Design a protein around this motif. Structure first.
Motif, PDB file in Angstrom:
ATOM      1  N   UNK A 136     -53.646 -19.094  -0.958  1.00 11.95           N
ATOM      2  CA  UNK A 136     -53.031 -20.079  -1.838  1.00 11.95           C
ATOM      3  C   UNK A 136     -53.762 -21.415  -1.854  1.00 11.95           C
ATOM      4  N   UNK A 137     -53.909 -21.972  -3.050  1.00 11.51           N
ATOM      5  CA  UNK A 137     -54.427 -23.322  -3.221  1.00 11.51           C
ATOM      6  C   UNK A 137     -53.318 -24.312  -2.878  1.00 11.51           C
ATOM      7  N   UNK A 138     -53.673 -25.589  -2.644  1.00  4.60           N
ATOM      8  CA  UNK A 138     -52.659 -26.608  -2.353  1.00  4.60           C
ATOM      9  C   UNK A 138     -51.489 -26.608  -3.336  1.00  4.60           C
ATOM     10  N   UNK A 165     -45.287 -25.671   2.061  1.00  5.57           N
ATOM     11  CA  UNK A 165     -46.331 -26.374   1.326  1.00  5.57           C
ATOM     12  C   UNK A 165     -47.698 -26.164   1.966  1.00  5.57           C
ATOM     13  N   UNK A 166     -48.725 -26.070   1.132  1.00 10.25           N
ATOM     14  CA  UNK A 166     -50.101 -26.016   1.593  1.00 10.25           C
ATOM     15  C   UNK A 166     -50.787 -27.290   1.114  1.00 10.25           C
ATOM     16  N   UNK A 167     -51.351 -28.079   2.024  1.00  5.84           N
ATOM     17  CA  UNK A 167     -51.999 -29.320   1.600  1.00  5.84           C
ATOM     18  C   UNK A 167     -53.499 -29.140   1.362  1.00  5.84           C
ATOM     19  N   UNK A 168     -54.158 -30.218   0.949  1.00  7.77           N
ATOM     20  CA  UNK A 168     -55.576 -30.172   0.619  1.00  7.77           C
ATOM     21  C   UNK A 168     -56.461 -29.891   1.830  1.00  7.77           C
ATOM     22  N   UNK A 169     -55.905 -30.047   3.025  1.00  6.59           N
ATOM     23  CA  UNK A 169     -56.677 -29.785   4.231  1.00  6.59           C
ATOM     24  C   UNK A 169     -56.341 -28.413   4.812  1.00  6.59           C
ATOM     25  N   UNK A 170     -55.554 -27.636   4.074  1.00  5.86           N
ATOM     26  CA  UNK A 170     -55.259 -26.264   4.455  1.00  5.86           C
ATOM     27  C   UNK A 170     -54.116 -26.100   5.440  1.00  5.86           C
TER      28      UNK A 170
END
Lengths: 82, 12
Positions: A47-49, A72-77
């Protein structure tokens, strides 16, 4: 960004992988992006952010439908659950 | 990252 490797496990209370559960993965708008039935293995996702939700539509016999799980998945994974 | 969902047993 890149896709984050998510591993999903549907289990019984004893911690054993449970087959027979019809599952949905939804995005932040509620659109179903993945559909499957559990088969006794860990299920992989990338999954992307963004914000997502695992939702159980039907449980196998003798079992109760679990509460949906929002994460949630953030921009830093990094992955943050409820 | 792991996400674990448990199917609870129905009442006895």
């Amino acid at each position: 960004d890149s896709a984050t490797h998510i591993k999903f496990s549907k289990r019984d209370e004893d911690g054993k992988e449970l087959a027979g559960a019809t599952m949905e993965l939804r995005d932040s708008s509620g659109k179903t992006i993945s559909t499957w039935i559990s088969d006794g293995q860990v299920k992989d996702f990338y999954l992307y952010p963004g914000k997502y939700t695992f939702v159980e539509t039907a449980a196998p016999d003798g079992y109760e439908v679990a509460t949906a799980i929002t994460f949630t998945v953030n921009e830093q994974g990094q992955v943050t659950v409820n | 990252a792991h996400i674990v969902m448990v199917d609870a047993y129905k009442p006895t």
